[PDB]
């Protein structure tokens, strides 16, 4: 049923266009690039703070990539080759870039040299690709992650690398209460952890068709890569040290997350800052006092820009209802509408997208009015949000109990366990089901093995 | 003389660096990074006026790009080729986008329906490849442009395809004159035109070691891509009639002129709206009254943030020339000095980038002072480029007389010409020269046929 309604709804919105001739790889239509145009501005203002965004190429040669021993194991056929250039093959092969690890580190040898240097903060929001799955789903598993925001730190001692790693934590919780969507954070197991990390922090989210999806992951890479690509500093006796490095990264699953999340029956509901209009203008008109109706319209569209607005005046000539309709399933926030009547008093009527819910407000202070009502609508949308999932997070006691709940309400489900291979391995086997990751607690007993039980961790059907 | 100051300022500046270990694929740095954003800004604010911006893959498979005529003979051998998926060899060649007509052509065939539809247009910056010239230059001529900003437009009449080709060249105008950046607009020659089009309008610019750099093109594409992708819309008839498209584009070259025009013995001169930082506060402290400068200071960048400026405070503990010299060889266009003497008096010494005059202004409406000043150096920067552009442009009546200017004085060569392949192509190899374009204009005769030339022509050695 999910399924169904992203798909319909990505193209009603007009957010991507699918039918490009090569699987996994889509187009940004105008309305979703507004969308992520807005959605990266959010991003970026909390990264700037203390983030320097650069921008690497895109082709990587043999020679580089494969210099690490298991990240070049991780991505081996994972990743796309060009060979020629023109008709000649060239004499080293470039791999498009699957991530920038392997980009960035060679030329990040270069940069640093002293600890005055350090710590070293950067980001890039490139174009990655990756050969996977021959299942494709749209802003969720594609060939071309047209939105990848990677971010790479370096540090001079191990302790900066962990701490590093807390703030990029509060970084995501940010970026996501700012869009309203709420997640899991748990340390990824070590067989899924990133490809020659130290470990990998995780934040899952719920679609609402009850599977999970990993929409941030944060990695310490210690200093293996430090290792590999000579990436010294001098320390501030005369000794020369590796570096301690941590790297982060979302995609466009970020955006697929915020239509699903808040999605509708009505079509998209967004938080007022990623939708491309805040607030819509619709005037109501029969031929009547028109001229004073437009002319309100226009003086009230200025005054909102002038204030910060993202606003659109919809005076096309159709049928106020289908403008209703629209912009509704487009996920403008608020819709002012004007008509003879509450202009010959001074008001006009706002409605919400969120609840529905219309009321009457004196054009005399407007602006304030939609600043409140926005700040109203992401809360509600982030509450609600959390509600619907907290409510599908289940504890379970028995192996078998658990395959009861997910088979039956989907969802997350928590448990304590021993945090052994096999003994993961054994229960992702027998549920059909993947452990997203482990959160350190009191302990108990494996509700597989019996044994003790240090670690809560969760599962569920994943993306 | 300018290669190696050109060089040497893109890396003490920190704009890119080309250490990258592959040829034609350079890095952007923090600051190079900011600059390019800066300059997009205010690409985008002209171009978000009537066009809408879109995002569409990278690769392109051999059927889709290999289905135009001339278009494909014109990228043949400078395409890059993407053979294999992992280990596996893909079963369909992909190639990187070196422009994206046939990524997105085949796609507009399916957008476009009716003449309602009409007319559209669209823009995106994304990153090209392209095979060619062992001769790579920063900015100027790599193999992965890092910033390549491409329109494309649709239009039911062919009148309207050159109403379009008038408006791009007037968006482009406004876009140079915003950077300071001289231009010379011409027809480029029917064997120069972009591979399958009508014609082609390309703006030129000089470099300080008198060659010319291409800026800009826009081509009228006619219905050539319409009849080869089958993009056909419905007239208000009934009938099937194909469109009329063109299209046009930017590189990081804008970037690099921007450097190279306005480039300077002290490093970067940038127009107020590009530079990284618009004024950079440098209190002036030899442990006297230092906590009131200090906190006059902070004062001062607080305020003028909230006043929309790119301010940055230089709270560093080095010596207050050292800080000169940096934001100086950076291009920061204002520099505001606060010490003990004019703090006691209200008033503080502004510094310019372009001049090096030093005034001194009243703290209390310094935000006035500072906008009025901003408009001042560019309307400086751009007056000087402008002029020593023309001063560069040179008639010529004799083919002999042209070669000793050129060899000489460098730049541009004015002439009349027939405008014929022969003649033009003749020229060129005895001068050793390129024939930029033409301008039509009253009769005379071609400099090196002595027929009737129609044409104002224009050469020079190019990049
Ligand atoms: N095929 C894909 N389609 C869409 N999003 C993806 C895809 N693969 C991964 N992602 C998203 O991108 C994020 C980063 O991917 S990753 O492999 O875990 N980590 C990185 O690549 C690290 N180098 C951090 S920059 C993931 O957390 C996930 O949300
Ligand atoms: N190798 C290169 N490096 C840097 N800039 C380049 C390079 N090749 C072309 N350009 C710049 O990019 C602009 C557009 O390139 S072009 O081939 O003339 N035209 C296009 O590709 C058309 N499809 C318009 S989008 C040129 O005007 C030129 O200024
Ligand atoms: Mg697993
Ligand atoms: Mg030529
Ligand atoms: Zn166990
Ligand atoms: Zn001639």
């Given at each position: 049923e999910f399924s169904e309604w992203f798909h319909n709804i990505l193209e009603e919105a007009e957010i991507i266009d699918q039918r490009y001739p090569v699987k996994g790889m889509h187009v940004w239509m105008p309305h979703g690039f507004m969308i992520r145009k807005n959605t990266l501005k959010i991003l970026r203002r909390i990264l700037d703070r203390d983030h320097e965004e650069v921008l690497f190429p895109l082709l990587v040669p043999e020679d580089e990539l494969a210099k690490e021993a298991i990240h070049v194991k991780g991505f081996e056929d994972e990743v796309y080759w060009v060979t020629h250039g023109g008709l000649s093959k060239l004499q080293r092969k470039l791999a498009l870039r699957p991530t920038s690890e392997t980009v960035m580190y060679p030329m990040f040898a270069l940069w640093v040299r002293s600890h005055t240097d350090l710590p070293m903060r950067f980001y890039q929001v490139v174009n990655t690709f990756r050969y996977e799955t021959k299942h494709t789903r749209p802003l969720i598993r594609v060939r071309e992650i047209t939105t990848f925001k990677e971010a790479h730190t370096i540090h001079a001692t191990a302790s900066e690398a962990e701490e590093q790693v807390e703030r990029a934590v509060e970084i995501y919780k940010e970026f996501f209460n700012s869009l309203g969507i709420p997640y899991l954070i748990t340390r990824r197991p070590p067989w899924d952890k990133f490809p020659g990390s130290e470990y990998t922090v995780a934040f899952d989210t719920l679609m609402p068709d009850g599977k999970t999806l990993q929409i941030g992951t944060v990695h310490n890479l210690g200093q293996t890569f430090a290792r590999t690509f000579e990436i010294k500093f001098e320390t501030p006796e005369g000794d020369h040290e590796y570096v301690h490095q941590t790297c982060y990264g979302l995609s466009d699953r970020v955006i697929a997350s915020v239509i699903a999340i808040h999605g509708d029956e009505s079509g998209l509901c967004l938080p007022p800052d990623v939708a491309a209009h805040?607030?819509?203008?619709?005037?109501?008109?029969?031929?009547?006092?028109?001229?004073?109706?437009?002319?309100?319209?226009?003086?009230?569209?200025?005054?909102?820009?002038?204030?910060?607005?993202?606003?659109?005046?919809?005076?096309?000539?159709?049928?106020?209802?289908?403008?209703?309709?629209?912009?509704?399933?487009?996920?403008?926030?608020?819709?002012?509408?004007?008509?003879?009547?509450?202009?010959?008093?001074?008001?006009?009527?706002?409605?919400?997208?969120?609840?529905?819910?219309?009321?009457?407000?004196?054009?005399?202070?407007?602006?304030?009015?939609?600043?409140?009502?926005?700040?109203?609508?992401?809360?509600?949308?982030?509450?609600?949000?959390?509600?619907?999932?907290?409510?599908?997070?289940?504890?379970?006691?028995?192996?078998?109990?658990?395959?009861?709940?997910?088979?039956?309400?989907?969802?997350?489900?928590?448990?304590?366990?021993?945090?052994?291979?096999?003994?993961?391995?054994?229960?992702?086997?027998?549920?059909?089901?993947?452990?997203?990751?482990?959160?350190?607690?009191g302990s108990g007993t494996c509700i597989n093995c019996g044994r003790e039980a240090p670690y809560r961790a969760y599962l569920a059907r994943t993306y």
């Open positions: 805040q607030v819509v203008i619709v005037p109501i008109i029969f031929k009547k006092a028109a001229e004073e109706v437009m002319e309100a319209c226009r003086e009230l569209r200025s005054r909102l820009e002038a204030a910060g607005f993202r606003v659109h005046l919809d005076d096309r000539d159709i049928r106020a209802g289908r403008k209703y309709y629209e912009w509704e399933m487009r996920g403008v926030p608020l819709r002012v509408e004007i008509g003879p009547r509450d202009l010959e008093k001074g008001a006009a009527v706002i409605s919400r997208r969120d609840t529905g819910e219309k009321v009457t407000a004196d054009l005399q202070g407007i602006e304030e009015t939609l600043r409140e009502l926005m700040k109203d609508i992401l809360e509600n949308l982030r509450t609600r949000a959390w509600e619907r999932m907290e409510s599908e997070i289940r504890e379970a006691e028995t192996l078998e109990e658990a395959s009861r709940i997910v088979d039956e309400k989907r969802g997350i489900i928590s448990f304590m366990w021993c945090g052994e291979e096999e003994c993961g391995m054994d229960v992702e086997e027998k549920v059909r089901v993947d452990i997203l990751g482990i959160q350190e607690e």
